[PDB]
């Protein structure tokens, strides 16, 4: 049956033109692609695993589109936040994310990135308690994480290191996926209290009593006041070798830094891009705080880089670092959406019809995207480009023998007359 696909997308358009909000179209496009992603994936010829991934990718694209256009377009402007110098850093961070839409967009994108991150299954047969092997062998004179750092790592049993590896890797995957609550649960429950505690430093300080404008979200002070310190402390910890590469990786991510080579070598376009947007973000916040004298000089223990990249440049670098992946045609759209250069790319792939015909999803996707765009933002895509796109896709509806559902797509030109 699967050669139904176009129906689903077409179907969604029917429902829209007929209850005469348009963001639902895309939401459905997403779900549609996802549903199809499942079909080709389950039981299939290994020629299908490929086009299955091109559907999952499809789906992620629709999601990213929804998220960003919702934020950008459903922008109806709220009330400005008036801080005082007595206010906590927490509030200033919030203010920053409110006022600077460019940067919040980075947040949105990171959220999307996390959403679609793979995490291993929870490690089984985890041991009763930490470093149990070393303790049992005798030779841990101190039971604290820093003991084998104070003096040769030869202290820790091999099996203990192997388990610490399992743990820190799992925690790392969870952190990259946004699963911070799960990471704290794992830390707690796996007898890694001190690491847990480390994960608690992630929050900026708020006090509901002082920072009135969040006395709703909070009933109790929380987060840590000397955060610039925390951050250097963690970063330095991240640079100290004789720690497991995933642990160092974790601290890197937390300090707004770029994890060690041993770990980073396995990160893909999404993972890598995520890492570097995290860096942009971290740097930008800490700079925002410095420009408002909410950082205390004592805390500038160490040099961290102060110069934030632009999303443009991060993308360019990550691209050159992952050319194959970068060049994949829906991930180009992903980037195009991220930079807003989107009608830009529409008109572009339009002129590539004048090695876009070779891949099937593309001509469809661009067309339905163009439709959505001009629905949500009348004017968005050049009238001509709509004409050209629908023209060509329609002729494929004909080549597929689905003339049945051509009128729906017609509802965008007087050129429709000619059908």
């Amino acid at each position: 049956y699967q050669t139904e696909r176009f129906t689903k997308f077409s179907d969604t358009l029917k429902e829209f033109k007929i209850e005469q909000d348009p963001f639902n179209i895309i939401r459905e496009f997403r779900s549609a692609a996802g549903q199809l992603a499942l079909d080709l994936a389950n039981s299939g010829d290994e020629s299908n695993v490929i086009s299955s991934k091109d559907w999952e990718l499809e789906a992620r694209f629709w999601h990213l589109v929804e998220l960003l256009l919702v934020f950008r377009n459903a922008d109806l402007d709220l009330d400005e936040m008036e801080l005082h110098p007595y206010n906590s850093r927490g509030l200033f961070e919030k203010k920053l994310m409110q006022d600077n839409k460019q940067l919040y967009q980075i947040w949105i994108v990171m959220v999307w990135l996390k959403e679609n991150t793979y995490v291993m299954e929870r490690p089984k047969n985890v041991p009763t308690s930490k470093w149990l092997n070393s303790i049992t062998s005798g030779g841990l004179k101190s039971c604290d994480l820093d003991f084998p750092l104070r003096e040769n790592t030869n202290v820790l049993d091999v099996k203990d290191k192997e388990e610490d590896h399992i743990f820190f890797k799992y925690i790392y995957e969870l952190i990259l996926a946004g699963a911070i609550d799960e990471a704290l649960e794992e830390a707690k429950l796996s007898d890694n209290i001190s690491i847990c505690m480390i994960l608690c430093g992630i929050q900026e300080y708020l006090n509901p009593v002082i920072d009135t404008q969040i006395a709703n979200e909070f009933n109790t002070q929380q987060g840590i006041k000397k955060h610039s310190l925390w951050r250097r402390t963690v970063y330095s910890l991240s640079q100290q070798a004789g720690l497991d590469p995933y642990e160092r990786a974790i601290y890197s991510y937390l300090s707004g830094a770029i994890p060690n080579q041993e770990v980073l070598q396995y990160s893909d376009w999404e993972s890598d891009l995520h890492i570097h947007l995290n860096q942009i973000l971290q740097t930008e916040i800490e700079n925002y705080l410095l420009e408002n004298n909410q950082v205390g000089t004592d805390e500038l223990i160490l040099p961290l880089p102060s110069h934030a990249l632009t999303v443009q440049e991060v993308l360019n670098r990550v691209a050159s670092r992952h050319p194959s992946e970068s060049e994949h045609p829906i991930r180009v759209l992903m980037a195009s959406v991220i930079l807003d250069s989107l009608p830009s790319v529409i008109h572009s792939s339009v002129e590539m019809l004048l090695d876009i015909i070779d891949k099937p999803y593309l001509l469809r996707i661009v067309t339905h995207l163009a439709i959505c765009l001009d629905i949500i933002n009348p004017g968005s895509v050049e009238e001509v480009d709509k004409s050209k796109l629908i023209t060509t896709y329609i002729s494929l509806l004909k080549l597929q023998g689905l003339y049945e559902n051509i009128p729906i797509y017609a509802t965008f030109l007087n050129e429709s007359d000619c059908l």
Partner: protein, 113 residues
């Protein structure tokens, strides 16, 4: 309340200052020094020495001293009970520091009394 608290504690640190600095002068053990820096309510130099003496995890932990995060409090205490029930050996000053993180350093069962 915060203001008053901060002035009182800055003052106490003014008084105990030389006592402790003398003690740091004579220590022969780094973790003990880290503890003494906590005795001068200097979280940052404790964190730094920890870092330098290659005690990095502790260092991170230290950064919590003076945020009253009850999670961290009950976790630190938990770690202490687990040690004080088996725990073949834990360094004498690391336990002291954990006891500080517990929020009840004498009021306790690993007591600084």
């Amino acid at each position: 309340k915060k203001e008053r608290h901060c002035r009182l504690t800055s003052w106490i640190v003014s008084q105990i200052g030389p006592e402790i600095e003398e003690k740091i002068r004579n220590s022969s053990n780094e973790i003990e020094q880290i503890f003494l820096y906590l005795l001068l309510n200097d979280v940052v130099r404790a964190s730094k020495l920890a870092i330098e003496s290659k005690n990095g995890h502790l260092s991170v932990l230290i950064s919590y001293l003076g945020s009253n995060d009850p999670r961290i409090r009950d976790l630190a205490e938990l770690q202490l009970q687990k040690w004080s029930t088996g725990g073949c050996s834990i360094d004498k000053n690391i336990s002291k520091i954990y006891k500080l993180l517990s929020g009840s350093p004498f009021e306790g069962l690993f007591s600084l009394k």
